[PDB]
Write an enzyme that holds these catalytic residues in place. Structure first.
Site, PDB file in Angstrom:
ATOM      1  N   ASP A 251       0.789  -1.229   0.000  1.00 11.03           N
ATOM      2  CA  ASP A 251       0.000   0.000   0.000  1.00 11.03           C
ATOM      3  C   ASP A 251       0.826   1.288   0.000  1.00 11.03           C
ATOM      4  O   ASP A 251       0.336   2.366   0.379  1.00 11.03           O
ATOM      5  CB  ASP A 251      -0.944   0.007   1.201  1.00 11.03           C
TER       6      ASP A 251
ATOM      7  N   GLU B 110      -3.095  -5.927   1.151  1.00 14.48           N
ATOM      8  CA  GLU B 110      -3.639  -6.396  -0.135  1.00 14.48           C
ATOM      9  C   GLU B 110      -4.615  -7.573  -0.002  1.00 14.48           C
ATOM     10  O   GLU B 110      -5.109  -8.113  -1.007  1.00 14.48           O
ATOM     11  CB  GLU B 110      -2.493  -6.807  -1.083  1.00 14.48           C
TER      12      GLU B 110
HETATM   13 MN   LIG Z   1      -0.355  -2.620  -4.017  1.00 11.45          MN
HETATM   14 MN   LIG Z   2      -5.085  -1.943   1.298  1.00 11.33          MN
HETATM   15 MN   LIG Z   3      -3.462  -1.788  -2.105  1.00 12.90          MN
END
Ligand SMILES: [Mn+2]
Ligand SMILES: [Mn+2]
Ligand SMILES: [Mn+2]
Ligand SMILES: [Mn+2]
Length: 175
Positions: free
Chosen positions: A17, A113
């Site tokens: 992220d 994720e």
């Molecule tokens: Mn990613």
């Molecule tokens: Mn996320």
């Molecule tokens: Mn992500």
DNA sequence: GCCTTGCCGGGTAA
DNA sequence: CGCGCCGGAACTTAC
DNA sequence: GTTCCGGCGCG
DNA sequence: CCGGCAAGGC
């Protein structure tokens, strides 16, 4: 030893992220960024930030943890050449992670994720190679899984963890 | 008849 | 002169 | 998630 | 990332 576990976890948040950015500005200024983005104000200020702070202290990085509020997301940002190379050098060695580090990294990546409904157990990414590495780690931890191209619109792959090992997955890695 | 897992589209959280 | 820490935030898309 | 901008600061 | 759907194995 315990910095390495927290390090692998943060690196999981980062690859998923966030980002490691080497910027060249006008001119010829530079900056090195270690970034984690997340929507939840709480997750970033009460969970991720204190962990980044421990690491910063432990490495004598004298930069500051910056938290910038954008419209869609919070961005945790440490502006530091040292911390940048710390994570980038660690990322270079990802194939040498020990069990503690593998587990921490997968947890980081899953928080970032993962299928968070936990109905299914899934991880998304364009980086097939990364998913392959995680897949082997999961296999040697007794978690069966497969990887295939999920989204043809964007070349995003998915690593599916078999529901048959749901419990072994949930308690070993996520807890 | 039920469970698992690949398929695929929407749009928000990266 | 060249370079490294702040503080945003517009912009695109990979989850 | 990524990279622009203008800021300040270092020797 | 989410979440409906259905192919297919039991
Ligand atoms: Mn990613
Ligand atoms: Mn996320
Ligand atoms: Mn992500
Ligand atoms: Mn010290």
């Amino acid at each position: 030893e315990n910095v390495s576990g927290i390090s692998a976890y943060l690196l999981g948040l980062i690859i998923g992220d966030g980002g490691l950015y080497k910027l060249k500005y006008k001119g010829n200024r530079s900056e090195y960024r270690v970034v984690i983005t997340q929507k939840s104000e709480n997750l970033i200020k009460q969970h991720i930030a204190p962990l980044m702070q421990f690491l910063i202290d432990e490495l004598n990085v004298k930069s500051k943890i910056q938290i910038v509020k954008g419209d869609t997301r919070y961005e945790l940002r440490v502006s530091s050449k040292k911390l940048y190379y710390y994570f980038a050098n660690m990322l270079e060695r990802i194939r040498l992670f020990n069990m503690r580090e593998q587990i921490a990294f997968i947890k980081g990546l899953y928080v970032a994720e993962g299928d968070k409904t936990l109905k299914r157990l899934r991880i998304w990414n364009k980086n097939k190679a990364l998913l392959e590495i995680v897949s082997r780690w999961l296999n040697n931890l007794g978690v069966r899984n497969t990887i295939h191209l999920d989204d043809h619109r964007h070349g995003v792959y998915v690593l599916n963890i078999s529901l048959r090992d749901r419990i072994k997955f949930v308690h070993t890695i996520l807890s």
